[PDB]
């Protein structure tokens, strides 16, 4: 049998023209993000799709993100579920800091490796952070199935596979064996994580993997719940590679 | 008391300004009704309450209500878990009439006998009903506990208290016991009805319990999930009394 899935990132927030890691600072969509996310749930609407099942990570962005979508389908009564282990990547002391500036700091490649790269895990944050309590004083991490000192403090691409693949195997895998109709509500980096472990990509290729934000990204699976082929993107396929490169250009230096 | 509770009725809706009984209609807050929402979840930060899980109906506006009240708490990824059982009182056929015009052409005190009697039952509504497509053909009612078809076409105070007792017993009373801290988003008469359980409150009193839409309710339960005392409305208690006195007033000529 054959089986298809709906993922995909939130759309933009403050910190997305200021060119900022956002990661795990629990930074709201702004007016832009939320209509990014109206719009793909008109996509999914005109598809006729019609979940059964919502998964978000615990950063507000991604579980808001959902809840447009599902009003925009009509489906608020669909069941959601939200895990720390669908969270955006951990930037670690990274968090906060401008992504040109790191490019003129340390170099377009160093940059890119800090970005894309499966194994580099970037510096991890301190208690001196300027939000560091922000993020492990709040709750949701007090009730996460790890304790809040276990918690990691920064995160490679290969160390969020680690936490998430074992959430995606237990709890989503199975219910799209039952044939369910489900819809990832992530992260641009936790989405990548789960993409390259379905679509069997290289450590060395996930590198030139970027994800557009508010895009709903199309993948079918087969018996062994392997990719049948690449993820697709819904939409305009100009404005989402232009959208693409953008993202790609926030990590160069003005030319 | 040894367990503290909280539930509440939605704020309003298009048809609370055309006064007409919505009930299994799934008609979305209006902008009033999405700010009485944040002025719930305002004055329950301000009390701190922190929630481990919510409880809400499939009906839409019970649900925007919760989400509401969560972003306000900062509270987005708290558990939500949705059921029919909890879905307002089926107004039946009387479903889209105007509860003024009711009043007039069959007397105030007929009216509110249907409002708030505990036994009185309303006309089952029929296929020929405007609204009963709307309602049956919808894909949340497809995946009940409980086939299509046997679901209720119109239900009295006790027929309400009867589909929701088990969603208590089975689902939310059990939680309670573990010390979660819990928020029931519902309506007006399915609210009515479990406070009737908890309060043990006699078929007699519940006809006189209106509540006034948009305000948190807390009860304080005790090992055996009863009422310690009765309900308490989270306000000025002034403004709740208007609110009240404004539900009640829909049944007047």
Same mark, same amino acid.
């Given at each position: 049998?054959?089986? #298809? ?18 990661? *795990? ?6 007016? $832009? ?19 059964? &099942?919502?998964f978000?990570s615990? &950063? ?7 809840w ?8 608020? *009564? ?30 377009? $490649? ?25 993020? !492990? ?17 920064? $995160?490679?691409? #290969?160390?969020?596979?680690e936490?998430?693949?074992? !959430?995606?195997?237990?709890?989503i ?6 044939? #369910?109709t ?14 390259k ?15 557009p ?13 392997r ?24 990590? #160069?230096?003005?030319?």
């Amino acid at each position: 049998s054959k089986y #298809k899935l709906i993922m995909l990132r939130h759309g933009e927030g403050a910190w997305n023209k200021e060119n900022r890691f956002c990661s *795990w600072v629990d930074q709201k969509l702004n007016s $832009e993000g939320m209509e990014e996310a109206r719009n793909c749930g008109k996509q999914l609407k005109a598809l006729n799709f019609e979940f059964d &099942l919502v998964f978000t990570s615990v &950063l507000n962005r991604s579980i808001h993100t959902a809840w447009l979508i599902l009003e925009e389908l009509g489906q608020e *009564w669909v069941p959601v579920e939200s895990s720390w282990r669908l969270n955006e990547r951990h930037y670690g002391a990274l968090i906060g800091l401008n992504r040109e500036q790191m490019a003129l700091n340390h170099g377009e $490649e160093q940059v890119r490796l800090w970005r894309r790269s499966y194994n580099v895990t970037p510096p991890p944050i301190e208690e001196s952070h300027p939000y560091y309590q922000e993020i !492990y004083n709040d709750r949701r991490y007090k009730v996460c199935d790890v304790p809040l000192d276990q918690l990691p403090r920064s $995160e490679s691409l #290969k160390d969020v596979l680690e936490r998430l693949l074992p !959430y995606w195997n237990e709890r989503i895998a199975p219910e799209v064996l039952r044939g #369910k109709t489900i819809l990832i509500s992530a992260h641009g980096n936790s989405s990548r994580a789960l993409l390259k472990h379905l679509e069997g990509i290289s450590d060395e290729d996930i590198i030139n993997i970027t994800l557009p934000t508010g895009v709903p990204i199309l993948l079918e699976l087969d018996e062994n719940l392997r990719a049948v082929g690449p993820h697709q993107f819904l939409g305009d396929q100009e404005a989402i590679q232009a959208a693409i490169k953008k993202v790609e250009d926030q990590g #160069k230096v003005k030319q």
